[PDB]
């Protein structure tokens, strides 16, 4: 499982 780019919201 690689990372996830940070979304525009949480």
């Amino acid at each position, epitope marked *: 499982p690689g990372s996830t780019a940070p979304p*525009a919201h949480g």
Partner: antibody
Framework: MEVKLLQSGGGLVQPGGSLKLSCAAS????????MSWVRRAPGKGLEWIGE????????NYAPSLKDEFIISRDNAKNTLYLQMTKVRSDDTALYYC?????????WGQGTLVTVSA | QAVVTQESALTTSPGETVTLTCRSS?????????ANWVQEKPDHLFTGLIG???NRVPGVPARFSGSLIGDKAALTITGAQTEDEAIYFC?????????FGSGTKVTVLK
């Protein structure tokens, strides 16, 4: 590597028809990115259509538009899709796919959709 | 049925500070609204400036900063440049969807 979201699809469509828009990502690991669809209509501003998580577990829509659009993706093809159904005049606009990096970070060149009989 | 409101227009001279506000019809704007700021220059060139209230998109200049002022979201452009003349849209997060505001036309007098 230079990033590019190449959009294809769109054009003139009759009221009530359906369209599918494609957004092929280049230069990023499309698999680990939140993707989103927004649109820009002449008299309106930006309007957020929706978003999808890298695994497609979650797909969020604008409540007013959720019964008209379907967002999907194929990470093997590095592509994001927006399906429009039963379109109307207010759907005439430039549609953009956006990649989230803390914000609306990466944008495609835009696809014009004109809905008119 | 949430409306995000902004200033119609703002005028500044190069080198002065511009402050854009972003208001929610529901109530106060919080960090749970993850205010996003997007810039549109002529010929529909869209650029992401801010996301999650305060977070800059990497590489965006530090002269753009996102904050909360009172019960609103705010984008401040310190030392606005002729390059920064654009329409600035804010988007507020409402649990499961983004609503964009009607945008503010920022003029940098040339």
């Amino acid at each position: 590597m230079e990033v590019k979201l190449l959009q294809s699809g769109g054009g003139l469509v009759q009221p009530g028809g359906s369209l599918k828009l494609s957004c092929a990502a280049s230069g990023i690991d499309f698999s680990g990115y939140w993707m989103s669809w927004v649109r820009r209509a002449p008299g309106k501003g930006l309007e957020w259509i929706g978003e999808i998580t890298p695994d497609s577990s979650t797909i969020n829509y604008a409540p007013s538009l959720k019964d008209e659009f379907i967002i999907s993706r194929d990470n093997a093809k590095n592509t994001l899709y927006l399906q429009m159904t039963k379109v109307r005049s207010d759907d005439t606009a430039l549609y953009y796919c956006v990649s989230y990096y803390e914000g609306f970070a990466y944008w495609g060149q835009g696809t014009l959709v004109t809905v008119s009989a | 049925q949430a409306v995000v409101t902004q200033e119609s227009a703002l005028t500044t001279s190069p080198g002065e500070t511009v402050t854009l506000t972003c208001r929610s019809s529901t109530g106060a704007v919080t960090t749970s609204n993850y205010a996003n700021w997007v810039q549109e220059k002529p010929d529909h060139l869209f650029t992401g400036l801010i996301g999650r209230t305060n977070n800059r998109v990497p590489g965006v200049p530090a002269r753009f900063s996102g904050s909360l002022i009172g019960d609103k979201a705010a984008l401040t452009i310190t030392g606005a440049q002729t390059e920064d003349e654009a329409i600035y849209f804010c988007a507020l997060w409402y649990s499961n969807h983004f609503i964009f505001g009607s945008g503010t036309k920022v003029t940098v007098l040339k």
